[PDB]
Design a protein around this ligand. Structure first.
Ligand code: FES
Ligand code: FES
Ligand code: FES
Ligand code: FES
Ligand code: FES
Ligand code: FES
Ligand SMILES: [Fe+2]
Ligand SMILES: [Fe+2]
Ligand SMILES: [Fe+2]
Lengths: 389, 104, 389, 390, 106, 104
């Protein structure tokens, strides 16, 4: 709330909460790194939803504390001092907190201080699943991780591999680009198309009514909320692009049929199936770091029944899928997102954009996100919630 | 040529009714007080349906970006709309609402 | 309109519109490059009055389209796709526009879209004259280019040669420095003064009444609006510089008399005649790129009766006039402009400046510009004009 | 004088003026450089309290003029033109000013201008003491320099040596870090501790009542206004830091007793005595440059009876004190200050900070500064005062 | 130490605050809201400020340091930045004398 | 010495009148209520003509930057002005306004 000019929010009556969520949605799980990236007793720093956080692994378990001392607000990470296995001591005046509950249990500079045991540093739930580290950037008891994950990601036999990086664009631009039916046009020359013999249209000529363009999911048992892109169920795919009726570009006529099952889910994770191969799936998150950047958390999943298969998949991922798909295909998505930054940077693009038919999918997502998000992260959450009696 | 849309009483004051026309773009019929007007239903700024917007007097506000049009003249009343809406004359005879088949 | 704090505009009653015109004046022609800089079928990018533009040459004629797709607001130039001679296709979802009128004539990703033929990308008139490319950054049918050019620039026999570059200062600081009668002091040690034996005073002691210090032209046969600097008509040239009665500096006692006819014209172009030599003239524009920068578009004109003289002039321009005058003389004007940035950056310099006699020329320009400009460019023009019924 | 959100100032009822003083206090003397850094006839530029200034030495005496021409507001320093011994001429239109009074005495581009003799460029008092250059960033005749200096700094026998540099943090964060009793913890691994065999606790367990934690000075004969940190008078120093009752860190058990007499004085200068050695003192200023930066003006004093002792002191300063103390000890203070920038950058830290016992010293300082400062510098002072006398 | 004698009820005007110092313990603050009496710890839970030096508005006490506030009856935070509840101490008037509990409730 | 400006009648209260003097700087005459005052016409902050400014009571506001002076004392009333204005003696003899040759 109060993230965007009220005049602008009053204009977008169909999805104001979404436009206001420049910092992301609070009270949702978010992947921030892979398990193998955080080692025992080796605290790591990160910024999520605008908040600086510290993550550490103690006796194998992950703990998350806000990286900001309660005293004078410095980042503990400037000079980490973990004097005991279960605690971290601020380098400034030695206020010491327990990783398990953030309680201020000691203060080396004043053992008699009345603050001892009467203050608590913010902590956030952390959970590891499929080799990924998820942090619940929210308050109170967290919901099951499954609620904030796409279908099948947590399947017992689904082997997950991936890559993560920081991209310079607001998370919403990333989400919309990923779920944008017609943006497929930017991938027409991707090495993956030719190299993996893909069938890939240039776009779609919609068919049927509005309701038929998507399937809004709000009745899932685990509580997940999302939208499926069904433009291809009544639409005629475009393989011959014309200008003035003359053919100037053609789509790809490969044999492999992929990405005909696309869905976006809160808090902001896309599921493309099957992709990049007929027997694989891609799940990618666009995690809010701050108003201008996000984590592009990419994962590819493929069923594996045992170690031999998991190992085989890993070798194929490193030598083919990572360079050819995650990079060779999605790299164009990265600069496309960056290209929309200016138009939306002053929040005016949310009013001036001129949409066309396929954007019906994006609109469905904006409405779903606005109605089922679990909270709007505000700058006040970052500095400290304010309230006057 | 004229299209018999509905009985005047089928619309409460300040409401909008979308009129689908096979093989053609949909229209929007507005009841402002006891008067009726008609325009193309699709906002000229995007894909929004004006029949799902907000009527304030004789001005229809688009549900998507807040753009607006005067339903009597079809001219834009609020940005970001810039392209005038197509207008259709309306006639109410014996309590029945008819809308011109062609824009004018 | 509304670019500066209202409290400040309320104080500068003599020229409020001018102080408000931080982004330049809309509805005027502006030179942005030389004809030789844009070849057939090779689109070029530039920013004018804060707007990103694209210029292309098709069948020898220039066309200008706003470099911002109507759809999601990306710059088409990120990845230029001119698929047919007369059009340009956005790299994102393939919305295609005609260079001639900006009409959205096709959409490769959805040939059945209802948006086709119902939208138009902004276009701006472009005209080439004297080897220079002028763009009418305005709306509606443009006025003759002559209205926005100094007298004689378009003379049939006038041979124009020049240079262009981007300078880091608001355009108004550039205009004022150029039309400033006393700024001649910064040129006292210019190589041109000695090398071209120029007579150059340190300044002028005004004579007569202030009304006689300038002469405003409110209308020409073509609608020109400008001001002539007449400080030398009744003023006394100052060649000796004294402090406490002692001589500490001297002006140049050369034999060549130049720059005794100086005028400034809307939208912001200076004419110095004769300069840098008794048989030449200088015309220079200070074109607004954004609030912090401008194009310093310099040109030197010399009447030529035949191809022999034009060739000779070109040789003299390259070997002498460009390096000795355009660079050797005007380079000091560049850092002078940059030096005024801080004082006016917070808009407070427009209130706190302490003017003296020779500034009557600047004041006349500010009033002329305020009364006859054809429009104030606003940030809303850049993002999209707004009006709420 | 409106430098911060009014809602925030209304909340900090105990030291609102201080929180509002983001640009520093006007009408106080401030050291900006050392005497040996400004030579005869060679103008030097610097920014103080947000104002660009020019300092010149003429016949050995220092003069200070604002580095902003009255005409079009350019910095005269872009191209310095001192055409006569007592004046400086703007490089743009040649408006000429006298260093002694800032009067516009000539204009080379128009010697007949009515502005000549009627306008005046702002000048500021400048005084040299102990090899340091102090500028009175204020209006009207200045008070004695001693008012804005800590006790003993100006002692005839006190030989002053030091270094100065620009640090990226608001001056207030520097002041509080310096006067912070518990921040001594960040110095536990300083090379000075071992290399100079110092006794240095990790912190203090306070004793006595609130008023006993400090000594607020507001009756000094010279007008000095400051606060003494007396936490060690009733407190039990901490030499064994514990977590869960288990010792995890120990203080330094050296023989040299230092820093047991610490005081902060307006406009923002700390005195640490004795330091870094039992026979020396440290005086350091945190001078406002702009809202994001300050000069960290460090000086060390040691009584010297003659040139012989002054030379030995200089050699030791260069070989030991400067490297081992001013840098080896204080460098940690530099990044500590920088570490607090984000929390207070939006002014919100002034409301959300959670203080503990030893911060009583900081509170005393904030209150002293709020009540006894000689003026709040504002952005309008920087651009040009604005008003309507109604 | 169960019941600490504070003062005569008559010694406190409605809407005032009185600090009660205790040897070996942290000070308390006794508030008079109308004709009723309440008590909490005197030290603000957000720092080192003395609530008896703040401003009482009805049954809400505002800290003089950062503007945080608490409800004097429940001890619950009423305004940011305060987040930690105050310990509440029972207060009784016997024979016109005000007494405050030596141990906080619960 | 004394210069003849005009008849007290020619000036309505709250108005200003510029007085051009041969071979000398211009003056400004102000009529506040039923009293007349005079000062240099040129603003001390620059080259503006105060006669082209706005009079509010006994305070004249410069049209260039909004600085102001009290016309009776010549003392600065609004920033950016800082240099006091030169004041000239005025005398109304026989319903006629006269201004002194030099500043008082
Ligand atoms: S800022 Fe962390 S203990 Fe003081
Ligand atoms: S779609 Fe109607 S205002 Fe944008
Ligand atoms: S942003 Fe250009 S076609 Fe979509
Ligand atoms: S800006 Fe200094 S003399 Fe003009
Ligand atoms: S000490 Fe009470 S609100 Fe901070
Ligand atoms: S010239 Fe009068 S206020 Fe500047
Ligand atoms: Fe993509
Ligand atoms: Fe010049
Ligand atoms: Fe320190």
């Amino acid at each position: 709330m109060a993230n965007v000019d009220e005049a602008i929010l009053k204009r977008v009556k169909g999805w104001a909460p979404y436009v206001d969520a420049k910092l992301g949605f609070r009270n949702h799980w978010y992947p921030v790194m892979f398990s193998k990236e955080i080692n025992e007793g080796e605290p790591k720093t990160l910024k999520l939803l605008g908040e600086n956080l510290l993550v550490n692994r103690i006796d194998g378990k992950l703990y998350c504390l806000k990286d900001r001392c309660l005293h004078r607000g410095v980042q503990l990470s400037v000079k980490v001092e973990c004097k005991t296995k279960s605690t971290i001591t601020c380098w400034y005046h030695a206020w010491t907190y327990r990783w398990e509950d953030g309680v201020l249990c000691d203060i080396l500079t004043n053992p008699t201080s009345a603050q001892i045991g009467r203050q608590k540093l913010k902590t956030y739930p952390v959970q590891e699943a499929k080799g990924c580290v998820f942090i619940y950037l929210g308050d109170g008891d967290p919901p099951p991780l499954a609620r904030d994950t796409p279908p099948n990601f947590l399947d017992d036999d689904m082997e997950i591999l991936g890559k993560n990086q920081i991209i310079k664009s607001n998370w919403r631009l990333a989400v919309e680009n990923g779920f944008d039916p017609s943006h497929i046009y930017i991938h027409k020359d991707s090495i993956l198309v030719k190299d993996n013999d893909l069938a890939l249209p240039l776009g779609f000529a919609p068919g049927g009514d509005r309701k038929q363009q998507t399937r809004v999911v709000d009745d899932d048992v685990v509580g997940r909320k999302g939208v499926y892109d069904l433009i291809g169920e009544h639409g005629v795919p475009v393989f011959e692009g014309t200008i003035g009726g003359e053919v100037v570009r053609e789509g790809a006529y490969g044999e492999k049929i992929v990405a005909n099952d696309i869905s976006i889910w809160l808090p902001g994770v896309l599921k493309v199936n099957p992709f990049p191969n007929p027997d694989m799936m891609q799940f990618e998150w666009y995690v809010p770091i701050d108003e201008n950047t996000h984590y592009y958390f990419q994962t590819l999943g493929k069923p594996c029944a045992n170690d031999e298969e998991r190992k085989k998949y890993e070798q194929e991922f490193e030598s083919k899928w990572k360079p050819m798909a995650l990079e060779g295909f999605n790299n164009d998505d990265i600069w496309a997102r960056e290209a929309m930054v200016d138009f939306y940077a002053d929040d005016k693009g949310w009013v001036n954009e001129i949409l066309f038919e396929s954007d019906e999918a994006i609109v469905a997502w904006r409405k779903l996100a606005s109605e089922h998000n679990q909270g709007i992260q505000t700058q006040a959450h970052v500095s400290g919630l304010e309230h006057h009696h | 040529i004229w299209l018999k849309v509905c009985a005047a009483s089928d619309m409460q004051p300040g409401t909008i009714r979308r009129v689908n026309r096979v093989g053609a773009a949909p229209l929007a019929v507005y009841r402002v007080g006891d008067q009726f007007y008609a325009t193309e239903d699709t906002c000229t700024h995007g894909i929004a349906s004006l029949s799902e917007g907000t009527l304030d007097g004789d001005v229809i506000e688009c549900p998507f970006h807040g753009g607006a049009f005067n339903v009597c003249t079809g001219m834009p009343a609020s940005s970001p709309c810039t392209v005038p809406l197509g207008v259709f004359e309306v006639e109410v005879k014996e309590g029945e609402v008819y809308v011109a088949g062609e824009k004018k």
